[PDB]
Design a protein around this ligand. Structure first.
Ligand SMILES: NC(=O)c1ccc[n+]([C@@H]2O[C@H](COP(=O)([O-])OP(=O)(O)OC[C@H]3O[C@@H](n4cnc5c(N)ncnc54)[C@H](O)[C@@H]3O)[C@@H](O)[C@H]2O)c1
Ligand SMILES: NC(=O)c1ccc[n+]([C@@H]2O[C@H](COP(=O)([O-])OP(=O)(O)OC[C@H]3O[C@@H](n4cnc5c(N)ncnc54)[C@H](O)[C@@H]3O)[C@@H](O)[C@H]2O)c1
Ligand SMILES: NC(=O)c1ccc[n+]([C@@H]2O[C@H](COP(=O)([O-])OP(=O)(O)OC[C@H]3O[C@@H](n4cnc5c(N)ncnc54)[C@H](O)[C@@H]3O)[C@@H](O)[C@H]2O)c1
Ligand SMILES: NC(=O)c1ccc[n+]([C@@H]2O[C@H](COP(=O)([O-])OP(=O)(O)OC[C@H]3O[C@@H](n4cnc5c(N)ncnc54)[C@H](O)[C@@H]3O)[C@@H](O)[C@H]2O)c1
Ligand SMILES: O=C(O)C(=O)COP(=O)(O)O
Ligand SMILES: O=C(O)C(=O)COP(=O)(O)O
Ligand SMILES: O=C(O)C(=O)COP(=O)(O)O
Ligand SMILES: O=C(O)C(=O)COP(=O)(O)O
Lengths: 429, 445, 431, 443
């Protein structure tokens, strides 16, 4: 061949609009501290509220923080007079009418990826635990039985981990798994840049053939529904292990149960199930919830967990920071980036030295001529910069205008409030 | 001024190579025929393969033998492989006519009368460090398990209870692991623990070069103050006996974790039990106890064995394991290789290096082209004039090289002598066998 | 004693066309740039050298985008004849060769490649450290003149030696990693407190660095503070037989002080890539006493490596400069993306899907005065504005707007109306 | 069942050594020890010897055969380098000489066979220069890659030639290491650190360091490498192993680096390849013929026919065999060898000796009072141990080791319960033995 070119590899201005924050479902303390440090008055609750007690409280509330339990429907959101934004201190947002919340000009924020590390660590733990049958050993000794067994108990070093879904969690797991001396194969429907010395594989069937531990880290889709069933378990190695901390639908439990009973699968660890209790309870996990529970809990070397993949102080702490920060930046700067129901819109902060500069936050219906109106109303002042984006029926305009005194604020606000397309207005000075 | 850098203390690397060595001479025993290996207590298959490939006739057993059936078998046996259960006392070893060496396919050797075995010229070998990785992995698993209360969660769901709890459940990342004893296991654990994102403090009675970004601490009390997880990897000594007790638990953080896969004596269980009940210790994992069953059994772990068992098993987030730290196919496999190899090299080359009861003695192999060269293996009483006698008896032949070392009352001489034909072997053997100091002789030709 | 606590928080798009494109490339811009432009259909004129102000003005009349380097000077004089010029590409760090203020006022966005050369300068310094440490230059020169001088005296392994990095920027920090990899201790002085990479240690005073370092290398910009910052007093503060490496700026080292220090056996060697005065062209006898009074004295000294500003002179560097800038121009021309521009408001919008038929992108550079958006948004009122962004850079400002439901008919109209506006500086419509 | 989960394939940090402080053994007779050091042995060696009480004579240069013979009469240990030739002629006058230290790689300057027959153990430092050669090559790779030498030479003659054409970042380039030994392997790590891919051809299969890949044929390495560097010994197989056919197998604009041996590269082939624009540059530290002393006009057509043609070429780095020419290298050579001699003199430890049986014994504790160490070099003939072990029969031999090296052999023995009285006796008896070549007693 021939030697050829190697491959290419100022303190900010504090904006003013008391602010009322209501937090439900035991939001982490980190969230509470962030809000209080900004002056906001914070109401905290360890549990949800009934539809009655809530409506009375959401009348005056400027920002509500919820989790998965509190359902915010059109019914309960219509009484929200001053509500600026909703914080989902969790992954899910189904508990909120996004479409409606949008139409009233309420921005919703969540924490999708705060639990990645917590699920990865759990899987390392579960790999070692299954490999050595810790659960069984500890249960035996607790009932007074001494069963010292080395047969088909393994060092994880030199074993192969099959990661189905190389996302946020799958990729973090990859690094840890290599660190613990595992070979890492991964099947994904998308071609993804491997971390460390991991190897992407063309077919799930190849992964199942060559892996000792198979773990799922995929979302819920028709493709993932019962994607691990009799045929897949038949394609896996004799005495291999199945780990599902992904979704309750992705594994066919009765197939797994047969495979385990047939001495084909040496053990498994499930964090998620097709049907799960709505609350913590004593007789919650039974044949009424899942027909096969009593059969499943009969099997040896099966680790069962009540959806604790992201159940850590770290996870809840960073969820508290991520979301509390998101709401704070939306309230203080109108920053709607990362919003799940809103146009994503932001502008560089203003310097302290930019005296007499107001920020216009104008959520409006996405129809022609609205900017014509607004920029006419602001024509008397120089627009340093502005940004407008649309999300279906709704749209959001941020504009920084210079040379406004206390006098002209009241005027500009009133004029914008009287506009045809207006859904909500805030002025930050 | 710009000066010579300090010379690298001992920071040189070893690129392992297929080393073109002059093919070595395969030595065979004299004055004997076929070799008899007896293996008890279900020694790994790797050991069996190694022995058969040497020509040895192998007798295998999944269990021990009674003192009766054993004495009958050890009469003819050239090498015995045992584990912890089979006790080889003066009583049963005195009947051992042909016994060359004992293999302890395990850490412990207490099950063997070493002093006596020595006096009869029997070399004992074991596998002290074959289980390091297996114990290290277990501890990573147990750290995560306790951190998240997996055991409890899985037990709840099995009894039908759904208890999703994040309160005082932790990511191990950013937490501190306190390693008491930075030996073979402690140091392997250090690397894994950093990989899992843990800070690693370690207290040891000896100053030790840290691996990765681990930090040695002056006092145990410092480690206990600053650690989230405390794990012991120390031998059994009067200094380690109940070294973690009420005062130590009192020095540890609120909601800290105690892991003992070291020795059954090193933790004061009733202090731990108090500490756990006092909400001081959030969880613990024990693999070892002051008293343990001798056999697997369903009623074995009870108040008769340890007064506090029924109280201990009453506590939440306590992982209990029946001494499985090294209970893996890998561990047993490499134990089989390490020890089987050790016995093979002792039987075939007289190599006694790594022996626990013997002088450690070896010589470089002989080349294939060194025809008519015999290796004299002469275990003898460690008294003056013995070498005078032996080297007199060999005087007719050139001694290429010899090595003699002493271990108290007993001593071992290896000697390579050149220009010996079948005729002179029988003579040299007989003369050496009739010597005053002789305890045992073998000639390899 | 304490409590177990929560750990600390962790440390197809639519191809838009203007409603032939002419690229002029001067000063031997890398081929990567040429290929990027041609693949987009643009007609490319290439030249290995600059043009004279006469031949240039004739060519820049029709040119849509010009790519230059440091030599070609684009003044008000030559830019005023630029009829169709959309953007300027500086395929190099410097932009002083361009009247930015003027280029801005005509609505011309200027782009450059500031950090494309980091790796190339870092590698050079590793090379020069080892070379000075062992006196390679001297040894090879001796043997070439027939002299055999096998010398180990005050020749060093770099392992266990200390590198003093003055200025811990893009280059300083890349150098830090390599230097540790080669077994060097890394001290660094900076005027700002900066997070160390690997196991490097920041030092409070330059004086401390100079006291404790074996090799001193500068990676600082040109400022009044850096001007001759290494002089007699600094060399006096350095270790006996220490080494000075300057691939930063020509002004930052006092050459005559260095020369005295070297002659006084205080500095064992040095490597300079940059000088107060440098030739404008490659030539024989270009580097002489006419250019720098001390050259003939400097080139008289042993263990001094001199290089003609080659810090970033590698196929890699030129290649990635070609990609970075050609890409920048392409995205500005094709999408109006002005992010990373040195003279312009930084403005961009997410690309439009292939499925977004009948959507036009309005690129409206205008004077930064009140009422302009009022006018523009009035003129566009007949169509829904999906999204728009306007930012200002002093006297000038830039508005990007995506409008939906426009047929060939209405484009011509909207263009004309916007072109007739009071504040207009330049308009393009992407359809 | 595609397969089954099976046993994974079967595969301590440094600690303050808690051993019973060892007994410092002193020679019987040898009242004061005489060390002679020639050819400017590093100061580290001098310090080691003086700190042990030895009287040290130092010289920056060699001695003439006359001045030397007069000095080697009384000398207990001599330290030399490559220049001082120790022949049968000059060694026969050596009355008290215990050991020779070669503070360098080569030992050809010493009659080993003869030195052996007189019972003189010779030691050297074979691998003390590994790091220094590895660093040089990294430097030379970057220098060739960027043409530093040329650039600096141009500017010195007043020429400003700013060139990026066929000048490279080393990152993403391939280094071909011919010979993955001590130097080759250290170079591998550094080269990866500098972002280079590392192929290596060796005649022996060797465990790769980092992410380096061993290659089956030299021809493969030459095809795929951007920089080729040799780190091989001098053998008939290596003689002119890189010639026209090899350069023809290399990439257009590739680079050749030889800091191995002067015989391994065919210079006139390289010169043609360079002139044919096939090789973009090269760096040679070694040549078929080299001056014996530093001098002006030493490197000329009289020494190598092609010099004047070679020095005419662009981007060729030439060095006068400086691969190991660093203060570090000389320092660690001084330590390695001085230590070796000290341990041989103090403990009879002959491990690492080039002409001797390699023999050693664990040190004796301070608590082992009245234990003498017998060092008995003797002719390798039957009945010698019979004699020695007879002579020592009155005492318990704790341990002894005897090994043979052709005609000569070496016995170390630790004997217990000897008082000053019995030492003089045992020494005399052993000195009068038929096979004796030399005896020392350490108490
Ligand atoms: N157990 C818990 O408490 C817990 C906590 C957090 C997240 N999770 C869930 O675990 C899953 C993984 O989360 P994440 O953030 O890593 O997800 P992600 O969206 O970041 O990554 C998922 C990956 O799976 C791949 N994928 C999708 N469908 C696939 C298919 N049919 N076959 C193969 N690969 C497919 C995608 O390409 C993607 O790379 C999600 O369902 C997530 O909500 C569980
Ligand atoms: N649970 C199991 O099945 C299992 C398996 C193998 C080993 N072990 C046991 O675990 C322990 C560790 O094994 P290893 O092979 O790593 O041991 P080791 O000898 O390698 O390590 C012991 C370390 O502890 C240090 N030490 C000694 N006394 C100490 C004290 N009082 N306080 C603090 N440090 C002290 C030593 O200096 C050394 O660093 C041993 O007791 C071993 O028998 C248990
Ligand atoms: N020789 C070449 O061919 C070549 C090529 C590219 C860049 N460079 C030049 O090298 C220099 C470093 O490049 P970079 O991209 O890393 O720069 P950079 O802007 O990333 O970093 C400069 C650093 O120097 C610090 N600094 C400024 N003034 C200082 C002072 N008086 N004392 C100490 N520290 C001070 C700054 O705080 C900053 O951390 C620049 O001048 C650059 O133009 C040279
Ligand atoms: N320039 C200097 O001042 C200097 C300094 C030290 C060493 N050296 C020389 O450089 C070489 C490197 O020394 P080292 O200590 O690394 O040597 P080494 O013995 O550690 O390694 C040499 C390697 O070459 C391999 N080899 C042997 N013959 C071969 C062949 N024909 N083809 C391919 N591989 C072959 C061997 O298998 C071995 O891996 C030696 O010749 C040494 O004398 C030069
Ligand atoms: O964080 C998640 O995964 C959820 O959406 C569950 O909601 P929660 O925080 O448990 O109320
Ligand atoms: O398990 C080990 O390795 C031991 O040290 C003792 O156990 P065993 O005798 O093999 O049951
Ligand atoms: O700024 C740079 O990158 C330079 O080296 C000077 O300009 P150039 O690219 O060489 O024309
Ligand atoms: O390469 C070598 O080390 C040599 O043999 C040269 O000997 P020296 O140390 O230069 O006297």
């Amino acid at each position: 061949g021939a030697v050829s070119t190697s491959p290419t590899q100022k303190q900010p201005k504090a904006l003013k609009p008391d602010m009322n924050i209501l937090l439900l479902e035991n939001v982490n303390a980190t969230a509470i501290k962030i809000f209080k440090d900004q002056g906001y008055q914070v109401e905290f609750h360890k549990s949800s509220l009934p539809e009655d007690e809530l409506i009375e409280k959401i009348k005056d509330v400027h920002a509500i923080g919820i989790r998965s339990k509190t359902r915010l429907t059109e019914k309960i959101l219509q009484h929200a007079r001053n509500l600026v934004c909703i914080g989902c201190f969790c992954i899910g947002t189904n508990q909120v009418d996004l479409k409606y919340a949008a139409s009233k000009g309420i921005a919703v924020f969540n924490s999708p990826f705060s639990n990645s590390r917590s699920v990865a660590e759990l899987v390392i733990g579960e790999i070692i635990s299954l490999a050595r049958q810790l659960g069984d050993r500890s249960i035996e000794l607790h009932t007074g039985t001494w069963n010292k067994v080395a047969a088909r108990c393994w060092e994880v070093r030199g074993k192969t981990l099959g990661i189905i879904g190389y996302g946020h969690i799958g990729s973090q797991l990859s690094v840890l798994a290599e660190a613990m001396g595992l070979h890492v194969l991964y099947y994904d429907i998308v071609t993804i840049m491997a971390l460390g010395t991991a190897r992407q594989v063309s077919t799930l069937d190849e992964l199942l053939n060559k892996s000792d531990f198979v773990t799922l880290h995929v979302p819920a889709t028709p493709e993932t529904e019962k994607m691990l069933s009799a045929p897949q378990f038949a394609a896996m190695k004799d005495g291999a292990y199945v780990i599902n901390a992904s979704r309750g639908t992705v594994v066919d439990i009765p197939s797994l149960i047969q495979a385990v009973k047939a001495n084909k699968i040496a053990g498994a660890a499930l964090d998620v199930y097709p049907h799960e209790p709505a609350k913590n309870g004593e007789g919650s996990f039974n044949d009424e919830l899942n027909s096969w529970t009593s059969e499943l809990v009969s099997l040896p070397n099966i680790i069962l967990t009540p959806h604790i993949g992201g159940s850590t102080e770290e996870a809840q702490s960073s969820i508290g920071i991520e979301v509390a920060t998101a709401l704070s930046k939306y309230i203080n700067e109108g920053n709607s980036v990362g919003s799940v129901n809103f146009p994503e819109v932001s502008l560089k902060s203003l310097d302290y030295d930019q005296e007499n500069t107001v920020r216009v936050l104008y959520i409006h219906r996405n129809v022609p001529g609205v900017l014509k109106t607004v920029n006419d109303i602001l024509s008397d002042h120089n627009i340093e910069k502005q940004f407008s984006d649309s999300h279906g029926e709704i749209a959001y305009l941020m504009a920084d205008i210079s040379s406004v005194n206390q006098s002209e604020i009241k005027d500009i606000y009133e004029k914008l409030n009287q506009t045809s397309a207006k859904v909500s207005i805030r002025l930050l000075y």
